[PDB]
Curated annotation (Swiss-Prot):
Record organism: Coxsackievirus A16 (strain G-10)
Function: Cysteine protease that cleaves viral polyprotein and specific host proteins. It is responsible for the autocatalytic cleavage between the P1 and P2 regions, which is the first cleavage occurring in the polyprotein. Also cleaves the host translation initiation factor EIF4G1, in order to shut down the capped cellular mRNA translation. Inhibits the host nucleus-cytoplasm protein and RNA trafficking by cleaving host members of the nuclear pores. Counteracts stress granule formation probably by antagonizing its assembly or promoting its dissassembly.
Identification of the protein by name: Protease 2A
Catalytic reaction annotation: Selective cleavage of Tyr-|-Gly bond in the picornavirus polyprotein
Active site feature: H15, D33, C104
Binding site for Zn(2+) 1: C50, C52, C110, H112
Complexes and interactors: Homodimer.
Length: 140
């Protein structure tokens, strides 16, 4: 589990979005595994605006943050998980690392701020849904 809180937005994995998220929907994209809902309180997070390929991510199934190198966001085939069938996921970054389903929502961060959240795992990789292209998160 986990979210990003920027301005009056809450960014979660689409597959972990609650009824309250869907009832306060701003934007959602199944192909990216992202959903954004509206918040009452202002968020603590700063979104990275950059093309870094190194950062640190939180792994809840290890209670640990790991430094990783990761691929640039791309359209990638993802094998079936407990929460999606096998499918193509867009805006996905991969790194070598540990990820189980419940690790979804862990933050990946670089020197510029939050890059994305854990979205995929298995076969010794961790996949992250990028948010650095969602410029509208930073205003309004
Ligand atoms: C219905 S779901 O959550 O998308 N998911 C489909 C693939 C299966 O491996 C687990 C269940
Ligand atoms: Zn960066």
């Amino acid at each position: 589990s986990g979210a990003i809180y920027v301005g009056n937005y809450r960014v979660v994995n689409r597959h972990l979005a609650t009824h309250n998220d869907w009832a306060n929907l701003v934007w959602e994209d199944s192909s990216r595994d992202l959903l954004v809902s509206s918040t009452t309180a202002q968020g603590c997070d700063t979104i990275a605006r950059c093309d870094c390929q190194t950062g640190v991510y939180y792994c809840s199934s290890r209670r640990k943050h790991y430094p990783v190198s990761f691929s640039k966001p791309s359209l990638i085939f993802v094998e079936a998980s407990e929460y999606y069938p096998a499918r193509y996921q867009s805006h996905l970054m991969l790194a070598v690392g540990h990820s189980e389903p419940g690790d979804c929502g862990g933050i990946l961060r670089c020197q510029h701020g939050v890059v994305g959240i854990v979205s995929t795992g298995g076969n010794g990789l961790v996949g992250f849904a990028d948010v650095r292209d969602l410029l509208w998160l930073d205003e309004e």
